[PDB]
Design a protein around this ligand. Structure first.
Ligand SMILES: [Cl-]
Ligand SMILES: [Mg+2]
Ligand SMILES: [Mg+2]
Ligand SMILES: [Mg+2]
Ligand SMILES: [Mg+2]
Ligand SMILES: [Mg+2]
Lengths: 222, 204, 241, 231, 250, 244, 195, 196, 243
């Protein structure tokens, strides 16, 4: 994976690639690494795929209950605290590496969490196997006082660096923009720079090609 | 002693035009020794089909477990579980055994009875959902199946054409794997009819 | 009639142990009052030290629960301190778990939930206390939330508790009918404290020395109690007008 | 009356009737006496039989080489409490290589009895104990009551008609406290003390039980022909 | 110490009555009136906001509560008991359903879980029953709109329309005259306000009345965009202003 | 302590009866009547809803008749909330058996275990018994069609025809009169409805105050079908036998 | 332990199980019966870890006998096999798993059919016309693939079984001291004494 | 990490670099290793980022609950809570923490807690991988009762050298000044400290 | 009625009669007092000599908690010991976690919460003791008195037992006559006088006096028993005042 997060004027934007691997094999060419914890708090997750989804869902569930209990919109620091303490408890065995971002009554926020429970704060962050390609771009083009459209450009450029240069990353760029005072906009497949070319041939077989021993109707009704 | 490759086996699913197909081999072995040529890896709960590769005892256990869980679902909900919902149930159940997992590669296939949409999904042994428009593969010849499907597949195939494509995907993948084969079954699934066909394949 | 000894329903659907816990509330014969300013929340309570042998500085029914939350209790001191220690522990845990300071209303709900449990579970008696929580919440602003032995809680524009609570309540009602607003339209907390004491004097019909009162003030980022001399300074200001 | 159903209930005058009823079981018990000098501490106990075919219920129990007690009331409760003392004395030896001070022994019994007077379901112990010992601060005598109250004394007596011996010892105080370096005389004083509590019955050879501990004497019990010397 | 009350506090009397349940229902009878009406394209639940003091801010006390984005609850009886039931009900919708199936429970099943919780307070050791009757309105894809009543016993019944609490007998009769199977949501809101006015004595406005609907999806209340399948909560609490608008054309 | 407030739910009377069980049965005798009739080619379950209101949603409602698995159903008389606790246990128990043996649970085995749970609440734990009586209707390949009843004591018995709840004495006499062994399902349907119609405390038996179900082999070849009757189907079967 | 075989024919299931019990460099016994009767028409043979085998077999036997007495009924071979599978499937994730492989030969009286189930220690169940555990399969499966027919008589099955034992006695490294053969049919379980 | 805390006339100053490492890759170049556990009790963190954060969070919770009941805790008390966590969980922790606080009675105080969980009260403390390179320098240059400006220079020069030699250390030099006057945050960038 | 048969039950007044009944057990006990002074606290208690057979000086009633706190109580003596045992556990765990010895107000609430907990359930009995206790911490001297209900306050002077009213009156005079403060050595003497004066309410059996003190200057902030010359001097001062 390559994942990034970038702060701007009036909020924060996160992005991710869409490749899922099992060793050298691409298992999923268009998987969703951007997770909704609450309406305006979103997570980008690298590491063990089932872990990032489960830990994101569990804390998301508990955040919803907390929001209902307190009659308040959830805060990013709450999701941050709950995630880090859960991950720390499991001493790194839950392999979730997360970039946590969002807006709340306190403002806009950007954090990252490591599987063992460490957190950090920044204006720009990147995690995953393509984080070095991404961070190289971020360290080259980031500046203070970015606009919304500048931050999206920077974030997706950082993801592209991972897509092209990291074998762990590929396919498409997903983006989520969380601006203060507005609804979070999830941009699924914001860029699709890896469309498969037309195949040279149709491999549609003449009907009857496959030898068959038996046929039978399967009963699915009661 | 790698739990996922003691018994062998494969499963593949594909989507077509208003239809889905799910196929599996019939082999069950103990490493080199072929033991059974009748071991089917596809099960169904109502109209939702589940294929499971990997350690055969866990394949059996999980089938029995999901039959258990879907039966109680139906009694309480008063309706058959849909593929999207069942996919979530499989994911939850697998992640529940996060640090002592079932050594399996399940595959969900079916048509949502409300929307009419074809649906397929795949999972790793610990619950990660892998959704796809086109095809899902699983088992000891997954590399081979990936190569066969990625080249042979085209969108919106008719049920009779989709049968040929998925069958040729499985057969040729199985023949490049020592632990897969020994027979094959293909399920063609339409909105309200399901046809099950046994394929003639080489028995070595 | 064992339905009057534990928290089970009587034939008329009542919980007598909860009702009697409400009567324990007035056992101290102390009246409290809370009001809100623009920037602050002031709570005042009577301070009666009858015994000459008591150290007056240790006689208090106002508690600093957290840096931002204060709580005044109406009821016996043992139950009062029980509630205070739990509230402190709950507010501390909330901050650790969720990464931000426990809001006054959320703590109120939590303490009210605990109180509700004692009304449903038999082995635990209700605490004979009414807890008034005050703060300047970072989201909701000046806040007054109050809990009772029934497990009931609600927010207030202003409130009063004690034996002569009704007199103070109507006095405050009549002021807010006149002012047409939800709070004391005052800049400094000093004058909101002065308002609170003034309207307590009018409602109760008694004069107060510096040792007859107890004052807690909540501002942004801190709740604090006043010393005898802080109150004396405040009493002088009222008298010279 | 309405407040004696269990130990967890106070009466309107602040009494614990279950504890008082436990105290009553001691009063029905056979008389036992305790007294000490500066060098030795002595227990004397009148044993009780069921009839002429039965044995005489043993009243004295050894706790350590330097400590032991006599009982009056429920004997099984004395067995529980003596066993506890045996363990506490033993813990002190194994862990600290230290002989348990007779005073601490009292404090430990007090706290064990007390817990049975404040909780639901339990009952007070129904036995009184006289603990004698010789430790680093010389000879000691303690009186244990199952209310929890433990008291250090020069001499005392508990059981039926214990008031006779208790009065006698109160008169004899100045004499017996200075019986230093003479075991047989301190016992004689204790045997004369317990004689003030006898009615219609006199001290026989399978009736009398004497124990002694002191400066150069381990806690030892005398029964049968070994007490014939003192009748 | 420790809970020594391991035995039932609700037991059968010689006549067969379960005393504590009966007495709990008596507490519900004393409670302020609340009602629910089911329309063809929605459900309305309403109740009076009985203020304890005019110094109290009745907005801070919510009698109508969101349980899931498509399910809402109101009650009659003891407020504190209701509050903790809402906490428990919200949690059980997650633990025993959403965390398993990745979607919110259908109304009947969430109701079933709340009923279970209330049944256990009727049989378990050292507890009294809950002193509340609930009205739970909700929507789900395969059952459409529904309205349920849950009693202290743990029994639940589906209703086209009903009322509970103080003036429930009169209110139910009023609803029988007005309810038909062709009612549109706005017609049901109108009837809800009419029915409630009979049982309310003092002020009757948007500040003394609490009212929520289960209707169309509200994309504007979702808080985010980009997922086509997520379309927003069907539960919506009507504002104080929205109630007064309908009280003029009453 | 708490001894003061203990009802002692699991003790004997001087006559050797269990107070709480007896009082629970007294509670059940006020619940709506439920009837089970076993024919040679199927089983009928009929039950009367407790005094209905016109604004009650009748179609999406379940109060008396519950499905345990595809081959077994129960009719309930007593506290519904209590019954659902037991029904969920029974549903899980059936699935446990199926998971263990790969065969559907024999009816008696399920009935015994549910009855054993009831028994436990009368002997230990100091809790009130479940105020519920069940009529079990089911099929298995050992005994075929079977009717059972269980009550708060945890005692269960098998029947050709049986009633629970209100007016069982009158209902049983009527069933004993018109029942014969060679009876068919459609005859049993009629008997069930006729009996309720005569024993009812209502003015007249209507479709909205009834729940109805059949368990037939009237599917296609050697398999069993459970039919929980819809409102309109009860309306039709009530007309077909000329009750309305 | 070591050699356990099973053949299902037209009307019966035949189980053959080696008689040797070897520990170290000593054959301690040459007449060991590696089987338990679970019910009148159900027989289970077993092989695996010392101690574990008999302990598991007798534990299963007790449970099936308990069931029989409770319900006054005999569980089907399929039902028994599923129970046994689940017990092994539980076991494999225990602190110390049962290292036991079993064959279950039964005659279903309701179906009037013989049934043979092969279950390994992991809980891997398969119904088979013929089955083997351990190294035995490496010789017998191919042999039976050739000579087995589904309509054979019990006598034909015994001759087919003689052919397997002969092959094992020729090519197997260890002396397993012959086999005890048992037949499961409509009339129950009986032992062939002269094999 | 290179971290240190130094007592002086008016109180105590804490200092740290800003480099967080995963091998030779710098995961964070602007880290804040100076952490508030109370208004005027802070700590310098070294070792595992996860461990030191989790410990600091628990300590801050403990001191918040302490303050609610007993008022402002002493710096010694804060160090004891750190110790208790580090000592009892020594098998599962990689945390080297320096605790520093300002009382009005006790003025500036520094406690260092190494891997084992022992406590050591010192005039000044150095820790982290980079500390090794400045033992010589710090011992030669530290004086008691320095001024604020002198102590800032001492820490600046010391961490500059620690950063220069230790690859694990770098970025900015953060400092936190603890006095009666309040809490002051200082930052010093490479272009200043590198050419010292 | 029956409201008084079970602990934790509210009467219609809002009272816990079982606690009020425990207070009766305290009123039955011997007199104990506490005097707060310039830089410390002084504790004294009446020990009724039931018999000649009681060993003098050897049935000690005042108890130390930690090394800086003293505790004395009237009522059921075993109950008081249970409370001190808890006090010692509380003080040990405070010193374990926080290093510093437990402050007196902190210690006061530890006992307070524990005693209050024994009014919450019907399965426990309230404490049959009022406890006077205190010591010296970083903020100076503190004196407290704790009652069966869990109620406690800070005191200039404190008294409980059969002669509490007599002792209270005598305490109030000292507070009035010494607004600036009483010295530690003076307070020891006064404690003796007050116990002797409070003994008039228990004058059948004669008694044994027991005094202890904590003073920043006189005992270095640690709890010590008053023995020998200082005790006899205090006894003589008391003997002179009754005549
Ligand atoms: Cl809560
Ligand atoms: Mg092959
Ligand atoms: Mg081959
Ligand atoms: Mg209660
Ligand atoms: Mg670690
Ligand atoms: Mg460097």
């Amino acid at each position: 994976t390559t994942i990034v997060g970038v702060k701007f004027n009036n909020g924060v934007v996160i992005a991710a690639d869409t490749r899922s691997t099992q060793g050298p094999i691409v298992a999923d060419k268009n998987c969703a690494k951007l997770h909704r914890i609450s309406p305006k708090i979103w997570c980008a997750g690298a590491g063990t795929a089932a872990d990032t989804e489960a830990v994101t869902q569990l804390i998301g569930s508990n955040i919803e209950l907390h929001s209902l209990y307190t009659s308040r919109e959830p805060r990013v620091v709450s999701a941050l605290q709950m995630l880090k303490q859960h991950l720390f408890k499991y001493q790194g065995h839950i392999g979730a590496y997360l970039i946590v971002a969002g807006v709340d009554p306190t403002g806009s926020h950007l954090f990252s969490i490591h599987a063992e429970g460490s957190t950090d704060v920044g204006y720009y962050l990147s995690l995953g196997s393509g984080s070095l390609a991404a961070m190289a771009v971020l360290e080259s083009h980031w500046k203070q006082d970015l606009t919304k459209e500048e931050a999206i450009k920077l974030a997706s450029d950082a993801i592209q660096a991972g897509i092209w240069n990291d074998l762990g990353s590929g396919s498409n760029v997903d983006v989520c923009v969380m601006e203060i005072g507005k609804d979070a906009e999830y941009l699924r497949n914001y860029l699709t720079p890896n469309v498969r070319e037309e195949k040279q041939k149709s491999y549609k077989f003449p009907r009857g090609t496959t030898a068959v021993l038996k046929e039978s109707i399967v009963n699915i009704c009661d | 002693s790698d739990p996922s490759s003691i018994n062998g086996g494969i499963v593949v699913a594909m989507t077509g035009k208003d239809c889905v197909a799910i196929a599996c081999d019939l082999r069950l072995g103990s490493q080199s020794l072929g033991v059974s040529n009748k071991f089917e890896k596809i099960f169904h709960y109502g109209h939702v089909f589940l294929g499971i590769t990997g350690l055969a005892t866990d394949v059996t256990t999980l089938n029995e477990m999901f039959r258990y869980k879907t039966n109680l679902y139906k009694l309480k909900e008063e309706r058959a579980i849909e593929p999207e919902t069942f996919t979530q149930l499989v994911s939850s159940s697998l992640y529940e055994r996060r640090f002592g997992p079932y050594f399996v590669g399940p595959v969900v296939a079916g048509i949502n009875s409300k929307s009419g949409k074809p649906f397929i999904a795949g999972f790793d042994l610990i619950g990660c959902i892998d959704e796809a428009k086109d095809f899902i593969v699983s088992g000891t010849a997954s590399d081979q199946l990936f190569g066969m499907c990625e080249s042979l597949y085209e969108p919106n195939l008719e049920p009779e054409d989709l049968f040929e494509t998925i069958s040729q995907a499985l057969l040729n993948a199985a023949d490049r794997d020592a632990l897969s084969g020994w027979g094959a079954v293909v399920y063609i699934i339409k909105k309200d009819e399901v046809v099950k066909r046994y394929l003639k394949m080489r028995q070595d | 009639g064992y339905d009057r000894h534990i928290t089970i329903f009587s034939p008329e659907g009542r919980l007598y142990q909860v009702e009697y816990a409400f009567k324990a509330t007035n056992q101290t014969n102390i009246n409290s009052l809370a009001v809100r300013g623009k920037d602050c929340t002031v709570v005042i309570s009577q301070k009666k030290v009858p015994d000459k042998l008591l150290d007056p500085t240790t006689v208090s029914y106002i508690f600093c629960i957290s840096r931002t939350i204060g709580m005044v209790v109406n009821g016996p001191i043992p139950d009062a301190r029980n509630a205070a220690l739990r509230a402190k522990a709950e507010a501390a845990e909330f901050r650790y778990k969720y990464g931000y300071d426990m809001p006054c209303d959320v703590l109120a709900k939590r303490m009210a939930n605990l109180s509700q449990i004692y009304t449903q579970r038999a082995y635990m008696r209700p605490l004979g206390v009414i807890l008034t929580f005050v703060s300047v919440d970072e989201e909701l602003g000046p806040s007054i939330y109050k809990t009772d032995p029934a497990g009931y809680y609600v927010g207030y524009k202003a409130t009063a508790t004690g034996p002569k609570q009704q007199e103070i309540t109507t006095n405050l009602e009549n002021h807010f009918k006149k002012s047409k607003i939800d709070h004391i339209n005052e800049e400094s907390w000093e004058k909101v404290v002065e308002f609170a004491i003034t309207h307590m004097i009018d409602a109760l019909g008694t004069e107060f020395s510096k040792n007859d009162l107890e004052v807690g003030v909540a501002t942004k980022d801190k709740f604090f109690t006043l010393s005898a001399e802080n109150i004396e300074e405040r009493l002088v200001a009222i008298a010279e007008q | 009356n309405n407040y004696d159903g269990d130990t967890v209930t106070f009466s309107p005058t602040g009494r614990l009737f279950q504890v008082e009823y436990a105290l009553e079981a001691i009063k029905q018990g056979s008389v036992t006496v305790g007294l000490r000098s500066n060098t030795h501490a002595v227990l004397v106990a009148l044993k009780r039989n069921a009839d002429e075919l039965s044995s005489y219920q043993k009243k004295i129990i050894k706790c350590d080489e330097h400590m032991g007690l006599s009982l009056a009331g429920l004997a099984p409760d004395a067995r529980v409490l003596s066993n506890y003392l045996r363990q506490q004395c033993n813990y002190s030896s194994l862990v600290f290589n230290r002989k348990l001070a007779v005073e601490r022994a009292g404090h430990l019994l007090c706290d064990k009895a007390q817990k049975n007077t404040q909780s639901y379901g339990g009952r007070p112990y129904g036995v009184g104990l006289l603990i004698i010992g010789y430790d680093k601060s010389g000879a000691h005598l303690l009186e244990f009551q199952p209310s929890g109250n433990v008291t250090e004394l020069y001499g005392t007596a508990i059981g039926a008609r214990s008031q006779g011996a208790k009065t006698y010892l109160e008169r004899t105080l100045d004499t017996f406290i200075k019986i230093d370096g003479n075991p047989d005389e301190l016992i004689k004083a204790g045997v004369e003390a317990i004689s003030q509590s006898l009615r219609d019955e006199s001290l026989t050879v399978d009736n009398l039980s004497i124990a002694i501990v002191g400066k150069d004497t381990p806690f030892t019990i005398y029964d049968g022909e070994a007490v014939a010397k003192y009748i | 110490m420790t809970d020594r009350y391991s035995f039932s506090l609700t037991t059968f009397s010689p006549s067969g009555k379960l005393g504590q349940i009966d007495y709990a229902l008596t507490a519900v009878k004393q409670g302020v009136t609340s009602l629910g009406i089911k329309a063809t394209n929605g459900v309305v639940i309403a109740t009076e906001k009985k203020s304890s003091s005019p110094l109290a801010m009745s907005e801070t006390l919510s009698k109508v509560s969101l349980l899931t984005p498509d399910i809402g609850a109101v009650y009659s009886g003891m407020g504190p008991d209701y509050r903790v039931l809402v906490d428990k009900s919200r949690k059980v919708a997650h633990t025993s359903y959403k965390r398993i199936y990745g979607e919110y429970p259908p109304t009947k099943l969430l109701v079933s879980e709340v009923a279970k919780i209330m049944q256990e307070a009727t049989q378990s050791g050292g507890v009294r029953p809950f002193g509340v009757s609930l009205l739970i309105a909700g929507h789900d894809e395969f059952n459409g709109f529904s309205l349920y009543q849950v009693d202290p016993s743990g029994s639940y019944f589906p209703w086209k329309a009903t009322a509970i609490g103080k003036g429930s007998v009169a209110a139910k009769t009023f609803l029988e005259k007005r309810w038909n199977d062709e009612l549109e949501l706005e017609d049901a809101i109108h009837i809800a306000l009419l029915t409630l006015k009979e049982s309310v004595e003092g002020e009757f406005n948007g500040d003394t009345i609490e009212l929520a609907i289960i209707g169309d999806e509200n994309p504007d209340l979702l808080g985010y965009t980009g997922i086509p399948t997520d379309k927003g909560p069907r539960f919506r609490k009507l504002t104080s202003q929205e109630i007064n608008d309908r009280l003029e054309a009453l | 302590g708490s001894r003061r407030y203990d009802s002692r739910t699991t003790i004997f009377s001087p006559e050797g009866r269990l107070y709480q069980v007896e009082y629970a049965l007294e509670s059940i005798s006020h619940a709506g009547t439920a009837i089970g009739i076993m024919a040679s080619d199927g089983i009928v379950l009929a039950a009367e809803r407790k005094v209905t209101s016109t604004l009650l949603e009748q179609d999406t409602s379940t109060e008396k008749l519950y499905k345990l698995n595809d081959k077994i159903a129960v009719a309930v008389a007593g506290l519904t909330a209590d019954a659902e606790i037991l029904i969920n246990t029974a549903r899980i128990h059936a699935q446990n058996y199926l998971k263990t043996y790969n065969e559907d649970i024999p009816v008696e085995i399920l009935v015994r275990r549910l009855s054993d749970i009831k028994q436990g609440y009368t002997q230990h734990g100091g809790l009130r018994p479940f105020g519920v009586s069940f009529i079990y209707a089911g099929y298995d390949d050992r005994y075929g069609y079977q009717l059972y009843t269980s009550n708060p004591s945890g005692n269960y018995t098998g029947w050709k025809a049986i009633s629970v709840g209100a007016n069982t004495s009158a209902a049983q006499t009527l069933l004993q009169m018109d029942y014969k062994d060679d009876m068919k399902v459609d005859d049993a349907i009629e008997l069930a409805l006729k009996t309720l119609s005569k024993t009812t405390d209502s003015s007249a038996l209507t479709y909205d105050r009834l729940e109805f179900a059949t368990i037939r082999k009237g599917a296609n070849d050697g398999e069993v079908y459970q039919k929980i009757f819809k409102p309109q189907e009860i309306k039709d079967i009530l007309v077909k036998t000329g009750i309305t | 332990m070591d050699i356990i075989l099973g053949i299902r024919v037209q009307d019966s299931v035949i189980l053959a199980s080696s008689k040797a019990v070897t520990r170290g460099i000593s054959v301690l016994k040459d007449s060991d019966d590696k089987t338990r009767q679970l019910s009148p028409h159900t027989l289970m043979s077993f092989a695996g870890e010392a101690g574990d085998t008999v302990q598991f077999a007798e534990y299963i036997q007790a449970n099936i006998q308990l069931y029989s007495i409770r319900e006054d009924y005999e569980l089907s071979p399929q039902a028994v096999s599923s129970f046994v599978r689940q017990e092994l499937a539980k076991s494999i994730r225990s602190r110390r798993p049962y290292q036991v492989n079993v064959l279950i030969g039964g005659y279903d009286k309701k179906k009037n059919k013989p049934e043979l189930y092969q279950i390994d220690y992991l809980g891997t169940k398969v119904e088979l016309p013929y089955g083997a555990h351990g190294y035995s399969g490496f010789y017998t499966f191919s042999l039976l693939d050739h000579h087995y027919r589904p309509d054979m008589t019990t006598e034909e099955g015994l001759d087919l079984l003689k052919l397997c034992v002969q092959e094992l006695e020729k090519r197997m490294p260890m002396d397993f001291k012959g086999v005890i053969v048992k037949i499961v049919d409509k009339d129950g379980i009986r032992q062939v004494d002269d094999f | 990490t290179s971290i240190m805390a130094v007592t002086f006339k008016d109180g105590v100053i804490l200092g740290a670099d800003s480099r967080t490492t995963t091998g030779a890759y710098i995961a964070n170049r602007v880290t804040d290793k100076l952490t508030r556990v109370h208004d005027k009790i802070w700590c310098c963190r070294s070792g595992s980022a996860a461990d030191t954060q989790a410990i600091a969070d628990i300590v801050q919770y403990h001191l918040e609950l302490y303050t609610s009941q007993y008022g402002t805790p002493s710096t010694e008390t804060a160090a004891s809570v750190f110790k208790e966590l580090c000592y009892e969980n020594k098998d599962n922790l990689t945390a080297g923490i320096i605790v520093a606080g300002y009382d009005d009675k006790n003025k500036g105080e520094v406690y260092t807690i190494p891997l084992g969980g022992s406590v050591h009260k010192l005039p000044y403390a150095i820790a982290g991988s980079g500390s090794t390179f400045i033992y010589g320098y710090c011992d030669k240059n530290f004086r008691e009762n320095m001024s604020k400006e002198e102590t800032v220079d001492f820490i600046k020069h010391s961490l500059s050298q620690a950063i220069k030699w230790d690859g694990s250390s770098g970025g900015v030099i953060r400092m936190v000044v603890l006095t009666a006057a309040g809490v002051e945050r200082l930052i010093f960038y490479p272009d200043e400290y590198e050419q010292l | 009625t029956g409201y008084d048969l079970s602990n934790s039950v509210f009467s219609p007044d809002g009272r816990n009669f079982q606690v009020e009944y425990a207070v009766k057990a305290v009123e039955n006990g011997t007199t104990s007092i506490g005097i707060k002074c310039n830089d410390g606290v002084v504790f004294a208690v009446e020990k009724l000599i039931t018999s000649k057979l009681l060993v003098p000086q050897k049935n000690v009633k005042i108890q130390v908690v930690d090394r800086h706190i003293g505790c004395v109580y009237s009522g059921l003596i075993p109950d008081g010991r249970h409370l001190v045992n808890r006090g010692r556990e509380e003080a040990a765990s405070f010193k374990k976690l926080y290093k510093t010895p437990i402050p007196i107000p902190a210690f006061a609430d530890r006992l307070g919460q524990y005693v209050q907990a024994h009014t919450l359930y019907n399965s426990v009995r309230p404490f049959g003791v009022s406890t006077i206790f205190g010591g010296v911490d970083k903020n100076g001297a503190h004196l407290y008195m704790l009652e069966p209900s869990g109620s406690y306050w800070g005191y200039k002077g404190a008294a409980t037992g059969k002669g509490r009213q007599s002792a209270k009156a005598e305490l109030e005079k000292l507070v009035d006559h010494h607004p600036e403060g009483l010295s530690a050595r003076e307070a020891v003497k006064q404690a003796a006088k007050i116990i002797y004066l409070a003994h008039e309410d228990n004058k059948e059996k004669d008694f044994e006096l027991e005094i202890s003190w904590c003073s920043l200057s006189e005992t270095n902030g640690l709890h010590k028993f008053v023995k020998g010359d200082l005790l006899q001097e205090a006894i003589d001062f008391a003997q002179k005042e009754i005549n």
